[PDB]
Design an enzyme around this catalytic site. Structure first.
Site, PDB file in Angstrom:
ATOM      1  N   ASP A  51       0.942   3.435  -9.555  1.00  0.00           N
ATOM      2  CA  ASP A  51       2.310   3.630  -9.093  1.00  0.00           C
ATOM      3  C   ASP A  51       2.540   4.825  -8.121  1.00  0.00           C
ATOM      4  O   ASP A  51       2.521   5.986  -8.541  1.00  0.00           O
ATOM      5  CB  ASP A  51       3.214   3.732 -10.329  1.00  0.00           C
ATOM      6  N   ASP A 105       6.255   2.265  -2.286  1.00  0.00           N
ATOM      7  CA  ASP A 105       6.113   2.145  -3.750  1.00  0.00           C
ATOM      8  C   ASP A 105       5.241   0.977  -4.277  1.00  0.00           C
ATOM      9  O   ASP A 105       5.710  -0.173  -4.291  1.00  0.00           O
ATOM     10  CB  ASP A 105       7.515   2.104  -4.383  1.00  0.00           C
TER      11      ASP A 105
END
Ligand code: 74B
Ligand code: CL
Ligand code: CL
Ligand code: NA
Ligand code: NA
Length: 371
Positions: free
Chosen positions: A36, A221
């Protein structure tokens, strides 16, 4: 330029993110950890949650250190909480090093872990500024570079249509991309904040004030499936996309993500859908470049059926998996910049490919930033 030992170290399911295998503690406890770039905390499951395959048993680690501090992480689509502490962490298919890193032992959660996923923790690859509870909690990557000879760089190749990819820690692998790498500067070091300067739908510019494209931020992201766009921008993109594709008709609820669209197995009319271009602020004053994605990237498959993987955002542009699956993304942390190049594994047809073209002449690119 060649890190064979790390090529193909990522695995995952469509919509459940990309994960790398890590080992926590002494003796090492293997866990699958979610990659992430959206978050800054290294947090693994520490309690027997039913969705979980495995979990961190601090009782069994000779090198576990208690920080005697709790961490509480509510966020838009869920919540996580746990106990802070430090332990030895290594990456079986990564650099050959072992690091003492901060670990939040997840002890209560809601809508955090995915039922059916194959991961138990998250690797927050972003900066301390957004780490919880405060910037004083050194993220994993910061711990990694500070304690080793690993360069302050990582690159991801997310591959899509079960999935796979490569996380090159401390470098670039040239086999993972075709052509040149074009770099955009990281505006601020919190999220991986970039600036979109111009948007085109099949070359037809959206003609919006560029501050709208980055209201309130624009981030890269890996922990988000969709390409999320600001509300005003999303409306403009859908009008344009709808226009470009009028050859076929679709329910209104399809662009809203509420419905699917099906075609007879492998009779998808890819060619009817436009390409999407995001012009990003270049390395030099008044210079830009553009990243072009295909319907292959934005029409996420669920008699073949697909979901419209472009959505309205209230937190600005989120260049998620829909964008990252078309490109080799370099996180050149040392040079406070992000490189983009055509993924050698991107999905495309015999007529169009994802592209990274440059250079362009774009004025007042600084004016596209939001304050
Ligand atoms: N970048 C992000 N990371 C977070 C996250 C990610 C995934 C998985 N990502 C979606 C998938 F699965 F489609 F890829 C998950 F299941 C749970 C999560 F909490 C962790 O950081 C939170 C902020 F602290 C915000 C959320 C949402 S966006
Ligand atoms: Cl090299
Ligand atoms: Cl604005
Ligand atoms: Na190359
Ligand atoms: Na919302």
């Amino acid at each position: 330029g060649s890190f064979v030992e790390m090529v193909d170290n990522l695995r995952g399911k469509s919509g459940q993110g990309y994960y790398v295998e890590m080992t926590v503690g002494s003796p090492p406890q293997t866990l699958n950890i979610l990659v992430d770039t959206g978050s800054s905390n290294f947090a693994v499951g520490a309690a027997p949650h039913p969705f979980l395959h495995r979990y961190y048993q601090r009782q069994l680690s000779s090198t576990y250190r208690d920080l005697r501090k709790g961490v509480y992480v509510p966020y838009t689509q869920g919540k996580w909480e746990g106990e802070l502490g430090t332990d030895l962490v290594s990456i079986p298919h990564g650099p050959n090093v072992t690091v003492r890193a901060n670990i939040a032992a997840i002890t209560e959660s809601d809508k955090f872990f995915i039922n059916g996923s194959n991961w138990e923790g998250i690797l927050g690859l972003a900066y301390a500024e957004i780490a919880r509870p405060d910037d004083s909690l050194e993220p994993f990557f910061d711990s990694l570079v500070k304690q080793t000879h690993v360069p302050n760089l990582f690159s991801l190749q997310l591959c899509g249509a079960s999935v796979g990819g490569s996380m090159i820690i401390g470098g670039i692998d040239h086999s993972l991309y075709t052509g040149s790498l074009w770099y955009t500067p990281i505006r601020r070091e919190w999220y991986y904040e970039v600036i979109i300067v111009r948007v085109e739908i099949n070359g037809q510019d959206l003609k919006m004030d560029c501050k709208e494209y980055n209201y309130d931020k624009s981030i890269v992201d890996s922990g988000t499936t969709n390409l999320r766009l600001p509300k005003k921008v999303f409306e403009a993109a859908v009008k344009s996309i709808k226009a470009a594709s009028s050859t076929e008709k679709f329910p209104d609820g399809f662009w809203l993500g509420e419905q699917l669209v099906c075609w007879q197995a492998g009779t998808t009319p890819w060619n009817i859908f436009p390409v999407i271009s995001l012009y990003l602020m270049g390395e030099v004053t008044n210079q830009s470049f553009r990243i072009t994605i295909l319907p292959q990237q934005y029409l996420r498959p669920v008699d073949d059926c697909y979901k419209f993987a472009i959505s309205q955002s209230s937190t600005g542009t989120v260049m998620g998996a829909v964008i990252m699956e078309g490109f080799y993304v370099v996180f050149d942390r040392a040079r406070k910049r992000i490189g983009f190049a055509v993924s050698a594994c991107h999905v495309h047809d015999e007529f169009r490919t994802a592209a990274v073209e440059g250079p362009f002449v774009t004025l007042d690119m600084e004016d596209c930033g939001y304050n």
